[PDB]
Ligand binder design. Sequence first.
Ligand SMILES: CO[C@H]1[C@H](O)[C@@H](O)[C@@H](O[C@H]2[C@H](O[C@@H]3CO[C@@H](O)[C@H](O)[C@H]3O)OC[C@@H](O)[C@@H]2O)O[C@@H]1C(=O)O
Ligand SMILES: CO[C@H]1[C@H](O)[C@@H](O)[C@@H](O[C@H]2[C@H](O[C@@H]3CO[C@@H](O)[C@H](O)[C@H]3O)OC[C@@H](O)[C@@H]2O)O[C@@H]1C(=O)O
Ligand SMILES: O[C@@H]1[C@@H](O)[C@H](O[C@@H]2CO[C@@H](O)[C@H](O)[C@H]2O)OC[C@H]1O
Ligand SMILES: O[C@@H]1[C@@H](O)[C@H](O)OC[C@H]1O
Ligand SMILES: O[C@@H]1[C@@H](O)[C@H](O)OC[C@H]1O
Lengths: 436, 436
Amino acid sequence: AESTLGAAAAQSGRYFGTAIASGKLGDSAYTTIASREFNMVTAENEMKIDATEPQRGQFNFSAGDRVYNWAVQNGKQVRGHTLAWHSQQPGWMQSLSGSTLRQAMIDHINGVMGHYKGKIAQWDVVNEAFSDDGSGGRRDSNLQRTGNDWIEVAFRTARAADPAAKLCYNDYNIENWTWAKTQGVYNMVRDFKQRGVPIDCVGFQSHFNSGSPYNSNFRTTLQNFAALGVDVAITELDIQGASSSTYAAVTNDCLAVSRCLGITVWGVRDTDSWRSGDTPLLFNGDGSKKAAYTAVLNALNGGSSTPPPSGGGQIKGVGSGRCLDVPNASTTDGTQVQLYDCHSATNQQWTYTDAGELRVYGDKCLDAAGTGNGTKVQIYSCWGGDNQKWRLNSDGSIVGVQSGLCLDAVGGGTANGTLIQLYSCSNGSNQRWTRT
Amino acid sequence: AESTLGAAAAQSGRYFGTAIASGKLGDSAYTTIASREFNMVTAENEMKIDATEPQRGQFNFSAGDRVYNWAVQNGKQVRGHTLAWHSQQPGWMQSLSGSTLRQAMIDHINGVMGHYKGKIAQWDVVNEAFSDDGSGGRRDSNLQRTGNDWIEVAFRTARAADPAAKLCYNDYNIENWTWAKTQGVYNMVRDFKQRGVPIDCVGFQSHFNSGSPYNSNFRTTLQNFAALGVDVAITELDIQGASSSTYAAVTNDCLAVSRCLGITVWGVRDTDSWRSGDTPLLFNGDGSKKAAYTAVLNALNGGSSTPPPSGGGQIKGVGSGRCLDVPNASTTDGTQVQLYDCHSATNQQWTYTDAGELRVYGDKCLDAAGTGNGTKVQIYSCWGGDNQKWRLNSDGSIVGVQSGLCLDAVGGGTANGTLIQLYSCSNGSNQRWTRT
Ligand SMILES: CO[C@H]1[C@H](O)[C@@H](O)[C@@H](O[C@H]2[C@H](O[C@@H]3CO[C@@H](O)[C@H](O)[C@H]3O)OC[C@@H](O)[C@@H]2O)O[C@@H]1C(=O)O
Ligand SMILES: CO[C@H]1[C@H](O)[C@@H](O)[C@@H](O[C@H]2[C@H](O[C@@H]3CO[C@@H](O)[C@H](O)[C@H]3O)OC[C@@H](O)[C@@H]2O)O[C@@H]1C(=O)O
Ligand SMILES: O[C@@H]1[C@@H](O)[C@H](O[C@@H]2CO[C@@H](O)[C@H](O)[C@H]2O)OC[C@H]1O
Ligand SMILES: O[C@@H]1[C@@H](O)[C@H](O)OC[C@H]1O
Ligand SMILES: O[C@@H]1[C@@H](O)[C@H](O)OC[C@H]1O
């Protein structure tokens, strides 16, 4: 099983990327993670219209190239984002309309693709052209007002500018098949393919949250578009709350569709997110892997034939054959957990939540009061602290998100009453566990 | 009164205070909450040694008086903090020792107490004089080196400077009766009382976290000290994670002790906390009441007529007589909840967690999309966002922490299938629920 997202994705011929912010590239903590985990890069803002053509006819690639250079220097491909869009247009363009805007759109496409010709894997040629008003129609923007054919023109222009790049139409809220927006976009791509309009891919931003939740029918959405003869890509993935199950579900949806090229999460750490408040990424503020990271990696690596327990379950240490136990079924915060003869008792029933917590009694969380070796692993009222979140590695180890240390049975102990602590991860049987 | 903390505590002859930071008195959002909820104020830094006597013999009461005046003008008494302490001493004092330091200590007490003579309800005369080494002995500091009798001298000095003030010894990690530090303090206070040393109160900072968790024996500690003939006060309360149950437990511990004068939480909003990372207070950064706030208020008002349910229970609407139900027991994120004939089924069993979530199925959370009226109330993977946290008002209403809006049966509906939304609280029967 591969150890990093990009490499794991590559095991199925796919890529796993992120959105890079040029201004954060001087931050070693940021780049260490980004360079290690992803093999695909999208400039978060540096290749947008305002950044690449600040004044009409004056193309500026300094910012975009800072991102591009970093990507290629570190073995990553690049997704160009984005050429035609109603948002983040430079002031001079916002003042345009009609034929003048139409030609500016065409000139912009030519200038940017010309500069990056032969260097970009995919280009989000047109972004967010459909409305969220429920009509399944076009967004009313200066671009749409130039004529309904603006999108088609953008793609034809792009094909000529760089016939080597995959041309994508990118949008959000087009993941749930039942949504009018999703179907409106489907009809457009269908029409394009039927009439010969150059389009090779559809990018699903995949910004999931309680307002626009992930739905299992996303797989049918991807299949529907793939059947039109275009590749599909998850371009700006982030999930409010970073549910491990939802992240794995989205990953498995892509792995289920042969035409799904790969997945790009919109950012590196939650603190780098445009929606940091939703802690929707795979790494938290201090750059540590979250429970969701492990779920995605597991999925990319093929997962397992035996689905993980749900609604509870024991945690038995392979070394002692004993289960994680809360002394005397106590509910006192600060109570250090131990290894004890497995038996049907709530004080041995642990639930691995999508947030990455290990709950017992329903409201008590496996908790670590410290980050160094020998830290006592105990129970404490659940509140979501990083010292209450864990990653269940495929090798059977259980690592604390905040500490990066493995649950360890003191002195390799195996007898009952053996205390559980944190300690540098090894491979010892006193650090491996089985979910029953 | 019973709608605010101070007023609710006053019903039992107690107070509920906070630590005030003079630098935030210009913040209306800050003062709106502070002036409304508390009837006791402790200067967070303005009455410390360094602040009141910048240079030997040269007293400055500008900052202290600003906090004192604000408190009194807004109907709050004041706890003086603090007269003798090893930490944060001014440069001129840190360089003193022996008899000279002893004299400085005595001079400082006379100057500060003389200035506030008869205006201070309680004074933390001596602060944190015991060690955390586990020996139960005195902390090794410049003060302790002047002679073991410095504490007694401090109290005798204080009593003379102002006999109208209650003189307290304040410390942290003295809440758990089994801890050696607690015993050391206990033995000293007992000795003082037997020898007539003028000590009227013992302040328990009450800083609870996974490293030094709340334990039910805290009530025993308070009761044991009270039995010595000294009042007790919870002086700097904050709880890592702000568990509703722990905050209510601490509140009830004070209400259970006749000598417990009141409770002071160490700050107004989590963003104002010296430990904001532990989100240990009763209000959020945006100033919204947290789940713990309601728990504390409810406790101060005399709890309920019957001990509230614990883990897994139905939530029945008063006006409809029907239960909060997840349509067809769906587990799909985004499923809007409804009212339905009550029956024993998991899709009707809700667990109110200490963090304020309302869980179903074990890892699904009552979730509000937006924050305005009409917002759909649904289920979504649990992650702890404020839109997944709720307050159980004694009046039977359920309010969302983020929105400040009440769970509402659409259009006062009462039939099966009536959808649930958020809406300005109205005390209506379509917004009232009972847990059975
Ligand atoms: C096989 O019996 C089950 C029924 O097929 C199943 O529909 C359910 O029926 C319950 C009924 O369920 C509610 C139906 O409306 C939904 O909107 C609501 O969310 C459901 O909770 O509630 C009344 C109860 O008497 C019915 O039996 O469950 C049946 C079962 O066997 O549990
Ligand atoms: C006679 O006053 C009534 C108002 O005219 C009426 O609008 C309503 O106002 C309530 C408000 O009602 C909600 C309206 O939307 C529904 O979907 C929801 O279920 C209702 O609860 O709720 C907030 C409350 O502050 C307003 O006063 O009811 C008023 C009344 O007193 O009956
Ligand atoms: O104020 C502007 C921001 O709102 C803008 O935000 C970007 C919007 O597009 C998203 O894809 C990006 O992640 C997000 O940063 O950035 C430019 C800034 O001036
Ligand atoms: O917690 C342990 C319990 O699970 C076992 O049944 O009896 C011994 C206890 O210490
Ligand atoms: O159990 C621990 C063991 O795994 C580690 O290797 O050495 C220290 C022990 O306490």
